[PDB]
Write an enzyme that holds these catalytic residues in place. Structure first.
Site, PDB file in Angstrom:
ATOM      1  N   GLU A 137       8.273  -9.495  -3.454  1.00 15.46           N
ATOM      2  CA  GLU A 137       9.554  -9.307  -4.076  1.00 15.46           C
ATOM      3  C   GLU A 137       9.601  -8.089  -4.777  1.00 15.46           C
ATOM      4  O   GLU A 137       8.460  -7.420  -5.314  1.00 15.46           O
ATOM      5  CB  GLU A 137       9.701 -10.304  -4.930  1.00 15.46           C
ATOM      6  CG  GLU A 137       9.833 -11.731  -4.093  1.00 15.46           C
ATOM      7  CD  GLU A 137       9.864 -12.958  -5.056  1.00 15.46           C
ATOM      8  OE1 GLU A 137       9.113 -13.317  -6.241  1.00 15.46           O
ATOM      9  OE2 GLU A 137      10.659 -13.908  -4.618  1.00 15.46           O
ATOM     10  N   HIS A 185       2.253 -21.663  -1.428  1.00 12.11           N
ATOM     11  CA  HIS A 185       3.213 -21.239  -0.262  1.00 12.11           C
ATOM     12  C   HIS A 185       2.155 -20.459   0.961  1.00 12.11           C
ATOM     13  O   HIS A 185       2.212 -20.851   1.886  1.00 12.11           O
ATOM     14  CB  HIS A 185       4.104 -20.478  -0.680  1.00 12.11           C
ATOM     15  CG  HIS A 185       5.125 -19.966   0.542  1.00 12.11           C
ATOM     16  ND1 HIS A 185       5.659 -20.746   1.429  1.00 12.11           N
ATOM     17  CD2 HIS A 185       5.465 -18.565   0.819  1.00 12.11           C
ATOM     18  CE1 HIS A 185       6.313 -19.909   2.373  1.00 12.11           C
ATOM     19  NE2 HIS A 185       5.962 -18.596   1.843  1.00 12.11           N
TER      20      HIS A 185
END
Ligand SMILES: N[C@@H]1[C@@H](O)[C@H](O)[C@@H](COP(=O)(O)O)O[C@@H]1O
Lengths: 525, 524
Positions: free
Chosen positions: B271, B295
């Site tokens: 990100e 995740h």
């Protein structure tokens, strides 16, 4: 490569054929693409445009009692008036803090003192003062700008002409710390009327002092004025030189074809002044020569000189190309920078930089810098770009010098590197140096010959802003890239990793600098 | 009059694309850039069983940032797509009294709905399905009052079956999960006459083996693993099918999906955003617990698992567990940490500039690590997990780099690769070397492409509504996942590794790239 330029020209020629087909009214472009596959103190003579005449215009000079506004902005506006480039019914407002009773004496004493008292101009001064008013106000009260608004609305509604509303050019002759305050105040308080009128804002340097401080100002202002409205002005970049750079190259196959790595040995951009900084340590000491003129002034010149071919002369097309080429530039290294700081002149007339009450003792601020920039792209890879700026040097001179590669064969010493010079100071000049025959009678009897290819700078910029032409103003993205080219270097300098060499006022600068240049590809003519 | 010539304006965009990318065929690139440069009654696409019975969705913590900015807009999107039953009931459950529930609806929820035309014109209709309910999270009587409110909507249901289905969405801190689940168990379970109960819970699922297992034991008296859905917002259906189908349906991909052929496997989550002034919260969590233990590990399981006995959800979940149980606990020597400092333009303040971050924080905002899967398929193959805030692009992908064929092509070839990318857009492609027409040694690297639906989050909510638990971490799976990371996390919390500063918007610390190159990866 001829093929680099050919490919661009083929793409443009395809987009051109999709232009005269789409002249018969996204989904139609996709279809057409695959289809093409298969194949004397005289009267002012008004030179203003029709639209300029057709709507009212108010120019608000904020900080009107400051040195920049009174000594520079208002005189510049005066010269444009004398040149017939302000609309007939132009209104001017000097906005400032101090209360003033005798409005007319202020114009005469704060402003007219500084007007060009020349022959062809002096006689127009009083005429110009009629178009000026004073406004007492502060730079943040919503009230003050409401009042100003109504003052403008009255002048605009008085305009004797066809369009309603009013064009408004807000000129911020202020310290950057108040830019955001004023800008929001204009936004909330004094924008043009709904009926019509554009809004434009000229802001003065500094535009930060590094990547981070510059982007904060951009972020502060961008809620209120976009890049069609905001005009970041560089006093020193004039029409005349910009046209020399762009037209001479892009209009002509001959220059266009040689404007690359295959032909050019080296490029210098030089900005030299005999004047020093005396009594300006208050501005200069914290800025240094690099932030002062190199990051802003010289880099825009460089961008215009190095850019790729824009599809048209529309301002934002050109600005797009300035950004693209700047993004090709490697951040300048401390290994490619020679710094200097001036001491007193050998003759004792000019005092050194440190010899100043407004400069801190011990300062290592550079008054002189020579640096090498690498532009890593197909057009420029390998070519040395030298930027050079300095105060208190041997002459006043701004120029671009392009040295072309030698044709060693077959003339040998009967020839010499071609050059192209574009000079702006102390006077405009543009020429190429080439080698020609002399009439006599052997082929190796040759000559060096100079073919000459040939409102001031600040004024030409204010005029461009009135015209809505942002070509020569740094765009927000452009500014950011430029700051990223220089900030790492500026950090190394402030961390002391390289240090200025002393040079006496009136010399060329550190001898080390001339050796750097010579060691970076330039050959003496 | 209309001399707009915005044509010229889009021609300019095309030009910039062509010259940025520089295609061989200008024409075909013009088309693809133009076509890719480009209301109605809702068409119910819902199935037989879904229309058969009342459905109620209860979102606990409805005025929270997660619920109003993520959960309710996702439900709106499902609604607009015809993916909710036509008589669906939605209840926002929160603790604050609200005078005007209609204003709450418009101000707290509808503000975050997609402004898309072809959606806007449905917002008011959707709001008619939403009620506000005010109550505590631990009082059985509030849940009985809630039950009465639901039973009322269920009993007016005009379709065939009786009772109703209930999906509880716990958009809450996990500290209150047990009390909500107990309260549901006592107070507002579905009617005996009919209806299922499903419960979606948000991360964190604990913060280590011990805390996580304690949480699982707090919930298992109330909900079993057919009722309990631990949601990972980021795991999309489209990525999971890319992982499962491309391999298991194909001899060619199945045959090379092993240690004999693969040099390294990297799973990357990047990100550009920082902690955005919520550093204080992040600081107790850190990047490893935030996205890696949950995740990236689920992606790893799906990528590395053995063939499932069938494509049933629990058969896939069984294999996810089996492979994770093969993975050795990560060592500190196989981990490189970073912490971001201010971006160049200051738009991202440094992690430590946030005043809500305590002085002396060594919380990692960046981590790269290597996992060892000790089984026949994977012995000796480096698996790299990489995640980072405040780096140089937003990007999520699996990169499988195959072994090189040194002979006979030598330098005229390089390692094949399979890329499955989810962000910033779905792509999946192989990089192989091929001949150039025109000199056997004259080769080219080419990408073979192997190819509004719901987004990843919406996909998962839709999956919960359909009873498909494939992409939800099961209780046993979770335990194993925690046993892989907990030693490392302990070492980090004891100060045995320290994060390397990196500037926000760069790649991260140079040591991380060197670590990747040191553990079996070769740059193109
Ligand atoms: N093209 C402009 C010239 O018009 C200008 O004169 C010179 C700077 O010199 P000065 O500071 O005296 O304007 O360089 C600029 O690029």
């Amino acid at each position: 490569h001829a093929d680099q330029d050919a490919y661009v020209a083929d793409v443009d020629g395809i987009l051109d054929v999709l232009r005269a087909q789409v002249l018969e009214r996204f989904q139609f472009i996709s279809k057409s693409a695959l289809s093409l596959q298969k194949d004397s103190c005289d009267r002012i003579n008004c030179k203003v445009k029709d639209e300029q005449k057709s709507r009212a215009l108010t120019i608000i000079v904020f900080g009107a009692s400051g040195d920049l506004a009174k000594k520079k902005t208002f005189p510049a506006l005066f010269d444009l008036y004398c040149g017939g480039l302000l609309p007939p019914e132009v209104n001017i407002i000097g906005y400032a803090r101090t209360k003033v009773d005798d409005v007319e004496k202020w114009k005469h004493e704060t402003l007219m003192k500084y007007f060009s008292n020349l022959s062809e101009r002096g006689c127009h001064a009083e005429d110009f003062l009629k178009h000026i008013s004073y406004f007492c106000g502060a730079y943040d009260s919503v009230d003050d700008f409401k009042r100003l608004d109504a003052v403008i609305r009255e002048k605009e509604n008085a305009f004797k002409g066809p369009e309603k509303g009013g064009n408004r050019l807000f000129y911020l002759a202020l310290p950057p710390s108040v830019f955001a305050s004023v800008c929001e105040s204009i936004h909330k308080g004094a924008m043009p009327q709904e009926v019509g009128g554009w809004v434009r804002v000229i802001i003065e340097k500094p535009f930060g002092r590094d990547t981070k401080s510059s982007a904060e100002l951009s972020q502060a202002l961008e809620p209120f004025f976009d890049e069609s409205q905001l005009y970041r002005i560089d006093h020193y970049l004039g029409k005349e030189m910009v046209q020399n750079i762009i037209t001479t190259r892009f209009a002509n196959r001959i220059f266009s074809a040689v404007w690359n790595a295959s032909n050019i040995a080296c490029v210098q951009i030089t900005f030299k002044e005999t004047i020093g900084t005396e009594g300006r340590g208050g501005y200069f000491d914290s800025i240094g020569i690099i932030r002062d003129v190199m990051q802003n002034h010289l880099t825009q010149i460089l961008a215009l000189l190095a850019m790729e071919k824009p599809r048209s002369l529309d301002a934002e097309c050109i600005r797009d190309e300035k950004v693209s080429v700047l993004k090709c530039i490697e951040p300048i290294t401390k290994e490619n920078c020679v710094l200097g700081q001036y001491t007193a002149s050998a003759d004792g007339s000019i005092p050194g930089y440190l010899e100043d009450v407004t400069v801190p003792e011990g300062s290592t601020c550079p008054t002189f810098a020579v640096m090498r920039l690498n532009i890593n792209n197909d057009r420029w890879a390998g070519v040395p770009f030298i930027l050079k700026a300095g105060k208190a040097v041997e002459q006043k001179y701004v120029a671009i010098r392009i040295q072309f590669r030698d044709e060693v064969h077959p003339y040998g010493e009967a020839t010499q590197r071609n050059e192209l010079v574009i000079r702006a100071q102390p006077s405009e000049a543009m020429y190429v140096k080439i080698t020609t025959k002399v009439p006599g009678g052997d082929l190796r009897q040759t000559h060096q010959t100079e073919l000459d290819l040939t409102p001031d700078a600040y004024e030409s910029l204010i005029n461009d802003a009135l015209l809505g032409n942002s070509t020569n103003f740094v765009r927000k993205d452009e500014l950011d890239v430029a700051w990223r080219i220089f900030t790492p270097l500026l950090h190394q300098i402030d961390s002391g990793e390289i240090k200025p060499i002393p040079y006496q006022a009136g010399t060329r600068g550190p001898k080390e600098a001339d050796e750097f240049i010579a060691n970076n590809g330039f050959k003496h003519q």
